[model samples]
Structures are given as C-alpha cells and as structure tokens.
Target: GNPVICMGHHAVANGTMVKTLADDQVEVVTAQELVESQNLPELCPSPLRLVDGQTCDIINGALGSPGCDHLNGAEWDVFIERPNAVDTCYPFDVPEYQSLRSILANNGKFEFIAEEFQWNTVKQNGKSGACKRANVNDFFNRLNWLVKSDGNAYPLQNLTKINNGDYARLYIWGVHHPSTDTEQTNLYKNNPGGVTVSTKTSQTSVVPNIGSRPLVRGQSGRVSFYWTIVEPGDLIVFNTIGNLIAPRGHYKLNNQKKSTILNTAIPIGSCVSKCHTDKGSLSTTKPFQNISRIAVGDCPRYVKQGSLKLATGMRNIPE
Candidate 1:
C-alpha cells in the first residue's frame, strides 16, 4: 500500500518508551521516534534517504538523503522527546467525572483521565524526590502485547451525535495540563478534509466528546494524548463509554422537570495554547463548553474580546 497520511493526534514524552533498540534495550525514546518508528515505514517504504536531525527511519529508512527517499518532503514536525519534561497523574476530580458520568451514563462511551506532565523541569537531575516518566510509544507497544490487536486502531474514533456517542468521545491536548511543542496542535486550523478532528471544538457540524486532547481544558487536534497514551486513560475510556445507557442531560436529577439542559459549545481550557488566537483570548465567534455542556460542542457561544470562536450553532440542547 502506498503511504497515505494518517491524520490523528497522540502525545509523547522524552521518556516515552519505544521498541527495542538495535541492541534490544528498552531505553525511552523521544516522542517523535515513538510514532515515526511505527508509522513512517508503514506510511511509505524505503530506498530511503536521510535528513540531518531526525530519528524516525532507523528501523526502516536508510538514515540519509540517498539518491532516493520515497516519502521525502512529507516530513512533518512531531516531537521526538522532551527530556526535561516530567509527568503527573490524571487530574480529573470527582465533580467533573460526576457531571460527565450523568451526561454519558447512557451513551456507549468511555472515560479516560489524561496524564499531566511538568515540562517546566526540575532544578537538579535525579536521585531527587518524587519523579517518574512515560514512554507513550513503548506504552502502546505494551498495550499491543496485552490486546493481541492493533494497527490503524489509533485509529480514528467517530462518536455518533445520535449516540451522544459523539458526546462520549473526548480527546484532549489540555492547555496547561501538559505541552504541545512542535506546533503539533496548529495543523487543523484549516483542515480542508472530511471534517478531520479539531481542537477548536467550536467549529460546526463537527461531533464532540465532553473533553480530551491537546485542546481539552484547552487547541491542537494533534490529540497529544501523550500523557493520554497511558493505559489508565484507556481504562477511563473503556469504563466511561461502557457506562452510557440513556441520554441524560441537565435537570435529570431527582427527575425534576428542569428549566433547560444547559450546555455550551466545545470549551477553552485552564491551559493556554502555544499557538496564537486572533484576540489573545477565547474567541467570541465560536462556542465554549464545560462540564455543564456534557458535549464540549453542545452549546457554543461567541466571546466578544476574543474573535477566534468557531462559526457554528448549538446542537443538542434540552428542548
């Protein structure tokens, strides 16, 4: 098969684990090598060439500009690793999950707590108090080992609006939760395809999950589930999605006939984007969502001071 682009988001770390090196050791690889090693050769085979300052093709490509390199000029920036970065645990408190729980209690969805990382770096290297890291690549490989399956499964997930299904599928690149270097989150700013995923969440006719990805709490669809790649997050999705059974929205509590289901468009996060927005604030043109909306894109709004808002209308609000 010829190499076709697989546009999806996944985060990585410096300590992100990758496959065994030529020496058969499991040293952590940079985030870039994690994805490239697996997909690059799969995307396009070699008769390859090399580029200075790159590591993806070692397994398949001939690490230099040869007379020929098949997927040349197709290289895009994906972070190799962020050595200085440290990771934290998923940080969703019960309140968020409680609200999320009610919203998707009936939808065939899943829940995942995103991993948090501290890229700010510590003062001195190791033998330090309380520290650890992740290797998303190797993490997934380990996942593959357990699942006895995978390939193209990172597959894309399309949550169905009917199922709230879409509401149940949250992918995030949480703003302050972690990082999105290499400008990974910016590509979708003008995705000219069949509604490729967007961290913008405000854009219309696009399906939405409550939250997840580089843009969660956050913008890049480069869904830096890097911390997201951890198996624990997968469980969150598994159990969360499985929890859905019926469409539950605002005012369902105690079976009260509520005023209305309050929802917002996909929301901005506590985190900030490395990328710039027109107004330097949440865009007013599009919608902003929160735990209340259940679906980040449910009922979007336009913030005045901020002009980068999505150009769409609220979809599944309580009638």
Candidate 2:
C-alpha cells in the first residue's frame, strides 16, 4: 500500500510564491501582507521607533548634541613644514649604495673628488665675517695651493692601486646631509661639491673635465672601481642595469628560477648606471636617474648569450 501526502496549503493564492519539495510544499507570507490582513495599527508607539517629539528629545538629551559647533566636528588641517633632506653620505654597506658601487667596480670605474683650495689673507681690524681676496693673484695662489696640497688626488691613487692588483677595489662618493631649510634650498639651487678624476692607460692619459660630466641629483659622479684577475682570457661583459622603486621581495626572475646571486636591497634614494668593455676598448654608458631599488637575475632566456657565459655577472640598485 502507498501513503498520500498533501502538497501546498489550500489558502495560498494560486500563483503565490511557495517552496516545493518531492513530497511536501510550504507557503510563504510577507510582512506587508500579514499586516494588511490583520489590520494592525499603522503607527508603532515605541519611543525608539518615532523620529520626532519626545523620542527625538530623549535622543538629543542622551547624546548631548552640539548642533553647529565648528570645533566639535571640524577636521584638523595638516601640512608638511619642510621637505625631507636628501642623505648624501649613506653607509657603504647599504643595499642600494652597494649595488651602485658593485656596478661601478665591476665596470672598472673610479670615484674622483674635487680638490679644496685654501689661501692666506690678512684680516681687517673690524671685519664682521671671514674675508678672503678674490683677485687674480689670489685666485692663482689658491689654484696652486689646491694642486699641491689637496687630498683629492688620493682617490685616483687608490683607484690605480686597485687596478694594479694591490687590492680588489675602492668605492668613493660625496656625502652631504642638508639639515636646515637654507642648506637644502642652496643645495637644490646650486648643487656644489663633486669629484673628478682622469682615466689613463699605457698609451694615453686624460685630464679632469670641468662641470659635472655625469650629473646626478643628491649624488654625483661614476663610481670608480678596480679589480685584477689572475687568469687570462677572462672576458667581462657589462650588460643592462637598472634601478627599482619597490622592495626587493617584489622582484622575481622572469624564467621562474631563483638564486641568491643577485638578491639584494636598494636604499630608498640613490642613482645607478652601467658600462661595457671588451678587448682593451672601454666605453661607459649613460647614468640612470633616481633609482630607488634593483633586482638581478639570469639574462632572459629569449636573448642569446654570445661570449658572456661564466664571466658575466650583474650589479643592480635595490630598494
């Protein structure tokens, strides 16, 4: 024998929404339909439900509403008093600085410092500040003094020493931290203080050229680096180099291969460049601007690796 089950409620309207199951069905009713059918009062008497009269008075009293007090709801005004100063003298070990240094060193570049000039002058009896003569003879004297006595030449000597295999390499750059507004303004206006050096080989010698050759803001000059190799026929290739603005962790190798070879960090603010040399002919590349970070990895698989196999390594700026 089979048992029969009723499907849906008979009172429900013919097309009214309802739930249907295999053997049973349920009818649904909306709040508006129930209220209309039951004829309940139109307004709720609860104080919380009403928007005016004593209900509003109670709410105002509880919260102590200040209708139009500017001080109570006004937003605080904010402005930066001064722009942050650039740190020129970053530590050598810093990731960004190190990356730049590595690239320069690997490319056989060296840092050069400008010589400081000093002069002898007789002080006036009532002079308010330090005074030095700027006449032709005084200028000549100052130039002579700088050529003879300044320590700026030490950087060049150090570079030569490294080239001669006395040491691996030496890194040098100007460091300045503009602490005050005036100093920062002056630095932005007339960026003074830079280094210059001459490159020489057995065949020829070059002199220092004036007026910032590779001008970099906040930092300047090509990083002078030197290294000596014991084995013959070790070819060095200076491939593409770049600076990254984001963190190092965000960078990944395009080929999905991972290694610690080029893993490094770049400080927040720095400058970077690249160079290429082969068969005793050297050529320096243009310096990159405002590089905040870097990442290094195997050259893209798509590009052909000509002669740079075991001897190829990259230097990159990191953030």
Candidate 3:
C-alpha cells in the first residue's frame, strides 16, 4: 500500500471515539462516508491558527495570533493586582498598557478590552472607605495576596507594572470546534447531542537554509559554521572540535569559519598547535605557540553550501 494512503487511514480514524468498521478486512471509510454514517461535522471549526498551524475555536471573544489571518484577530485583556495600581488601573493606562495597545493594534493581532480591579481596600482609620490614607506597605501586601489567590477571577488586573517592563505577557485560551457541515449538525442535533471529541490539525516543515555533511579524518570534508561577531561565546563547532584536540589555547574570535587542511600529517601537539595548524600556520611561539590563524583569503570551502530548503513537512489530523 502507498505510504500516503496508509498514513491517511490513521489520520482519519485516530481521533474518533467510534470505530465504524464492520470487520477486520476493511480499510475503513472515507471522511464523507464516516460523517454520513456517524453524522459528524466535516472538519473542526477553528477561528485561531496557532504557531503550530493548528486551528482553534475561539471561546468567548478571544482571538488568534495576527500572523494567521484565517482566524479571528487576537483578543487580550489586562490584569493588575497592585493596590497602588488597582483602583484606576493607572500604570496600565500609562506607558505599559499604552505600548501594549499600540503594538497589538499595529499588528492587527489583538483587541484589548479595558478591565478594572474591584477589590476591597482598607482606608486609614482601620475602616473601609475611611477618609484616612492607606500605607504603601499594606497596599502591597494586599496586592501580593490578590496575585497569589484568585489570580484569574473577575475584572482582571493588569500585572504589567509588577513585571517592571512596559507590557505584560499575554495569556489566552480557546476551544476546538468542528468545521460546519450538515452531517455534523445532524449528529449534534439528533443522537449524541454534543461533540465529545474533536480533531486537531496542523502543518510542519523542516527549517530552510540548514544542511549537514559528514566529516572524515583522511577524506576532506567541509563544514559550514556561523557565529555572531560581537559574542566570542557564539563559536559552536570550535568548542566541540577543540575538546577533541587536547591542549587548550587562548584564541578568541567571533562568527568566523575557515576551512584548512585536515590531514593526519598534521601533528597533534597542544590545543594551540592543532588549532593554529587547522587555520593553516602561525609565526609566533610560547604564548601563541599552537594558536592557528587563517588569513583573509584562506577560509575553508563550504562543503554543503547553504541553500533554502525544507527537510520535511508534517500535517496534523486531530485524533
């Protein structure tokens, strides 16, 4: 059997609770036939397309990421628990909420609904709504408790101020609904009366522009490495290959990959020797004895040249 067709069987039947097969010899039915026989929705209805490309049904008014327009726009609400920031939700109105509103708006990914806090605060004189002023310490303590307990209850508070940054990390939740179809509606309307299970769908593809080529000691093999010029710690392969070469050396460079002769003929002295030899040759001794440095025109050739390509593609069928 073709792999694609065989795989499709699992995709269609995996998530379903009812196994409609009459015998072991059958390959199962098509999605259409399954829908008609079981009276199920054609496909799950989702308003949000997540980073994984899975469709999500919007619950309440929440929306999906702006990157995916197929779903409704992202919807976010603010929450704050600080006594000082609660009442009017001041800080949220100031720089923090303002910045969040601007970004979400510009991206067209989220819609903000102004939510206020309504917790009881004791006034000075130990009475509620008293003319006395409240201490900052007490207010903070109350705010801390609010955050610890009842975090998600009621008019949510904007916690961005407590985060120190200009915006709060958005939290969202939604449900998955089946795509509209008469069979699905009939199933929901007639027999089961409710959708107990729904399928999840997604797509995946290998990241482009990355490839690998094996390296053999005697046979020349090329490796392509990348690093940032500012941070010397960004050197990836150097650290790995350096560990294999014993004696350590003090060479610091950033985002530089050079190919040089890698033959057994080169003596493996100190870490410095092998490194220096790998980059061609060096003229210094003692402190720089084994340090290798490649000149501007002597970089190694990239064996697997970088090109935009995807290694694999995957699509999810919710089970």
Candidate 1 per-residue lDDT, tens place, 31-118, comes to: 2211100101111111111122122221111111121133233321111111222222222222243343333222211222232222
Instruction: Tell me which of candidates 1 and 2 scores higher on TM-score.
Output: 2
- Could you tell me how far off, in angstroms, the CA of residue 134 lies in candidate 2 after the best superposition? 45
TM-score of 3: 0.12
Q: How close is candidate 2 to the true structure, as a TM-score?
A: 0.17
Model 3, runs deviating above 4 Å = 1-92, 111-319
Once fitted onto the true fold, the runs of candidate 2 whose alpha carbons sit more than 4 angstroms away are 1-168, 175-192, 201-260, 264-319
What is the C-alpha lDDT profile of model 3 across 1-319, one tens digit per residue?
A: 7556333523444321222235322332231111101101111112212111122212111221122233333321111011121121101011233343333322323333232323222111111111112322121111111111223222212111111222322322111111233322321222111111111221111111112323232212111111111121121111110101111111122122221112112222222211122223232222212122322122222222222122122222446
> How close is each model in CA RMSD to the real structure?
32.2, 28.5, 33.7
Candidate 1: Cα lDDT at 68: 18
Q: How far is candidate 1 from the true structure (C-alpha RMSD, Å)?
A: 32.2
Q: Each prediction's TM-score against the native?
A: 0.15, 0.17, 0.12
lDDT of 2 by residue, 184-284 (tens): 23322222222232233212112211223233423332222122221122221111111000000100011211212111111111222111111111112
Q: State the TM-score for model 1.
A: 0.15
